[PDB]
Amino acid sequence: SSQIRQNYSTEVEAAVNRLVNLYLRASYTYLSLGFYFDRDDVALEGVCHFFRELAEEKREGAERLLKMQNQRGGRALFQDLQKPSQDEWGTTLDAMKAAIVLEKSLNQALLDLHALGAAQADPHLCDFLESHFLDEEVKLIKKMGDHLTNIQRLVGSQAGLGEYLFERLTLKHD
Amino acid sequence: SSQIRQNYSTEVEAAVNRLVNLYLRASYTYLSLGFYFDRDDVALEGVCHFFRELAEEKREGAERLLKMQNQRGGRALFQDLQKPSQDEWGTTLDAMKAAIVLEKSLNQALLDLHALGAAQADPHLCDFLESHFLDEEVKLIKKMGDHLTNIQRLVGSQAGLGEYLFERLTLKHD
Amino acid sequence: SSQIRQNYSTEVEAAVNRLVNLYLRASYTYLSLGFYFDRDDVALEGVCHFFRELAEEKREGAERLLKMQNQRGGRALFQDLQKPSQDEWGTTLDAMKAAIVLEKSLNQALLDLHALGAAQADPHLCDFLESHFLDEEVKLIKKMGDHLTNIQRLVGSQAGLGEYLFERLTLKHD
Amino acid sequence: SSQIRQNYSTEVEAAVNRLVNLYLRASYTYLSLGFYFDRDDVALEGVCHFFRELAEEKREGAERLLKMQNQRGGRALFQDLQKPSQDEWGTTLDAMKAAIVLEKSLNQALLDLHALGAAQADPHLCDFLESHFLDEEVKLIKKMGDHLTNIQRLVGSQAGLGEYLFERLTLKHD
Numbered sequence: 099s100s101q102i103r104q105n106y107s108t109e110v111e112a113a114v115n116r117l118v119n120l121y122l123r124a125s126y127t128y129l130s131l132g133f134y135f136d137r138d139d140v141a142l143e144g145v146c147h148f149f150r151e152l153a154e155e156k157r158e159g160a161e162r163l164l165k166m167q168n169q170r171g172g173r174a175l176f177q178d179l180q181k182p183s184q185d186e187w188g189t190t191l192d193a194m195k196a197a198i199v200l201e202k203s204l205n206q207a208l209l210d211l212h213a214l215g216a217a218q219a220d221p222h223l224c225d226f227l228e229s230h231f232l233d234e235e236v237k238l239i240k241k242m243g244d245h246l247t248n249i250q251r252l253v254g255s256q257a258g259l260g261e262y263l264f265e266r267l268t269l270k271h272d
Numbered sequence: 273s274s275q276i277r278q279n280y281s282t283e284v285e286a287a288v289n290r291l292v293n294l295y296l297r298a299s300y301t302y303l304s305l306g307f308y309f310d311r312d313d314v315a316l317e318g319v320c321h322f323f324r325e326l327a328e329e330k331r332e333g334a335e336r337l338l339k340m341q342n343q344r345g346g347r348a349l350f351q352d353l354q355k356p357s358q359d360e361w362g363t364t365l366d367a368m369k370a371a372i373v374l375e376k377s378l379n380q381a382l383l384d385l386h387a388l389g390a391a392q393a394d395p396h397l398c399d400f401l402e403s404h405f406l407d408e409e410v411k412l413i414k415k416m417g418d419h420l421t422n423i424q425r426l427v428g429s430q431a432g433l434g435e436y437l438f439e440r441l442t443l444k445h446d
Numbered sequence: 447s448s449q450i451r452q453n454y455s456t457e458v459e460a461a462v463n464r465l466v467n468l469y470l471r472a473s474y475t476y477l478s479l480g481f482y483f484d485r486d487d488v489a490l491e492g493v494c495h496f497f498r499e500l501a502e503e504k505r506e507g508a509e510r511l512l513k514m515q516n517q518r519g520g521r522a523l524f525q526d527l528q529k530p531s532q533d534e535w536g537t538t539l540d541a542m543k544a545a546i547v548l549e550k551s552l553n554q555a556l557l558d559l560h561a562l563g564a565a566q567a568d569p570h571l572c573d574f575l576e577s578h579f580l581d582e583e584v585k586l587i588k589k590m591g592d593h594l595t596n597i598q599r600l601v602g603s604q605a606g607l608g609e610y611l612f613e614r615l616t617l618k619h620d
Numbered sequence: 621s622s623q624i625r626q627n628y629s630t631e632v633e634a635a636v637n638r639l640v641n642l643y644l645r646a647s648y649t650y651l652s653l654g655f656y657f658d659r660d661d662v663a664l665e666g667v668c669h670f671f672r673e674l675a676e677e678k679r680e681g682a683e684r685l686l687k688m689q690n691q692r693g694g695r696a697l698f699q700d701l702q703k704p705s706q707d708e709w710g711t712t713l714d715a716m717k718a719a720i721v722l723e724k725s726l727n728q729a730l731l732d733l734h735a736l737g738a739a740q741a742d743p744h745l746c747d748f749l750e751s752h753f754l755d756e757e758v759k760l761i762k763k764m765g766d767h768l769t770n771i772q773r774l775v776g777s778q779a780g781l782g783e784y785l786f787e788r789l790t791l792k793h794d
């Protein structure tokens with residue numbers, strides 16, 4: 099049993115475990131997106147690298163949450179990780195739209211947990227999210243929005259050409 | 273149109289644009305103060321440099337606010353920038369008193385925007401101000417207070433001598 | 447009062463203050479253009495950086511003019527800074543057309559002030575503009591003209607594609 | 621006889637020789653000022669160094685004029701150099717007032733020669749003065765004005781104290 103727990107509600111403990119599940123689900127989704135764009139019949143290396151990087155970022159987020167759970171004297175509880183929502187992710191545009199939807203859902207879960215921490219007068223939780231998650235999420239959604247706009251301007255009437263150019267000239271590749 | 277905006281009220285968007293206007297007005301005021309102390313008939317280089325540095329700091333503050341406005345999916349809207357309140361700024365003491373008045377007004381606008389963000393449950397906004405503005409402002413007002421006290425102790429009966437010494441021995445110059 | 451002023455007409459002093467206002471207005475316009483191209487629904491980083499750089503150049507021009515005003519024993523007088531002419535700046539082409547219009551107006555104000563200095567037999571003023579402004583302005587307008595031509599050749603029937611390519615392959619970005 | 625002279629009037633040739641005489645007279649005046657402030661009963665090292673530096677600057681100005689006279693195919697003609705106007709130069713304030721008077725007379729001679737060159741359509745002469753003399757003179761007069769203002773603020777009721785402090789804290793010394 100914990101000898102350290104102080105000002106750490108059962109509600110926050112549970113919500114932190116749910117959020118870990120959401121981050122790991124997001125990581126898994128990004129793993130699937132990354133490997134889809136590595137298929138020989140898709141072959142957009144920059145897109146693959148973008149999503150693989152995000153899989154790592156989301157796993158790291160989950161790990162930070164689990165570290166914090168222990169720091170507060172809460173108990174990590176893991177659940178089944180649902181498989182991603184799709185097996186094939188369509189075009190770069192389809193994929194980036196799906197990623198922004200996912201990110202907005204994570205962001206809402208962050209905001210909801212912040213509000214619960216504020217209601218419970220748990221400033222450590224609130225600070226933790228502010229310091230390590232809220233701005234990271236805002237920055238990422240801005241980046242995805244910027245990408246979506248560029249991808250959309252490139253569709254025009256020459257969709258394949260635009261998809262190639264975006265991958266070659268915006269996204270990081272070898 | 274924005275595809276990223278989330279948890280970002282129209283009230284906060286508008287107040288952020290007002291605050292940008294206040295920072296730019298403050299920058300302009302400091303530009304005028306800096307060049308006043310560079311006049312051949314005023315000639316207090318350290319005072320000039322102090323206010324020119326502040327003009328840059330305030331412009332940078334405005335730029336950070338504008339970057340954040342975009343990160344959140346709000347829309348920058350610029351207004352007329354009113355000219356500074358004075359064309360001539362009197363003594364170093366007069367100028368530092370005017371600067372502290374200006375700083376307290378900026379600080380109050382920061383606190384008001386923080387309170388609005390708290391009321392709107394917008395923790396990203398609240399964190400942003402905490403992290404980049406509130407302590408910077410407290411530190412600056414402390415510095416100005418410290419200067420005012422030194423300037424005031426130096427007036428005595430030999431005001432010109434004191435004004436020279438403060439500029440030479442407290443403020444940074446070549 | 448000044449003990450240094452020599453061969454420096456009231457007409458030139460006033461015109462220098464007007465020109466400072468024009469440079470600062472131009473800086474403000476470029477600030478607005480820069481942040482417009484940073485919007486998530488515009489997202490042309492190279493265009494954003496081009497105009498932000500110009501905002502800094504124009505502010506530096508104003509600062510040089512103010513330094514010179516003091517060097518000659520004139521008195522800086524600041525006016526209200528009008529807001530930019532537009533809140534949204536359209537396409538890269540629209541924006542670059544607006545920038546060239548702005549630059550031509552600044553250039554004309556430089557030429558007018560040079561002519562006034564020549565009429566007043568003020569060679570220091572004339573030299574100052576020659577040395578720090580006239581060629582800088584000619585070079586900048588040439589660069590903008592070169593950009594406009596490239597942007598125009600890229601419109602064709604695939605306007606989005608051309609706008610992306612210009613930003614990626616001509617303008618400086620990360 | 622010259623085989624190079626082109627577009628170089630006898631009027632400008634003569635005025636250039638007069639200006640050389642004025643620069644050398646100014647150098648001599650500064651030599652006298654420098655050594656006055658090195659007297660054991662005056663003993664203001666920073667003031668001494670300021671004026672000795674100016675003696676060198678004025679001699680260098682004369683040398684540049686003489687080089688240019690030869691470059692244009694004119695003929696240097698030297699006259700008697702009148703001794704400085706005073707044998708003793710009073711206070712630092714008296715001396716700096718005398719220096720500004722001297723500088724304004726040199727500046728007027730520069731402006732007069734520029735106007736003659738403009739009237740004679742001699743752009744090389746005009747450029748030469750612009751490039752090597754007019755701004756140097758404006759900068760120096762600004763510096764002297766700045767010094768005068770500081771010296772004047774330091775007189776107060778404690779003139780000796782102020783004169784010492786100005787020399788110690790504004791002027792360059794060992």
Ligand SMILES: [Cl-]
Nearest residue numbers: 176177178179
């Ligand atoms: Cl189970």
Ligand SMILES: [Cl-]
Nearest residue numbers: 351352528529
């Ligand atoms: Cl308006």
Ligand SMILES: [Cl-]
Nearest residue numbers: 354355525526
């Ligand atoms: Cl007004």
Ligand SMILES: [Cl-]
Nearest residue numbers: 698699700701
């Ligand atoms: Cl003789």
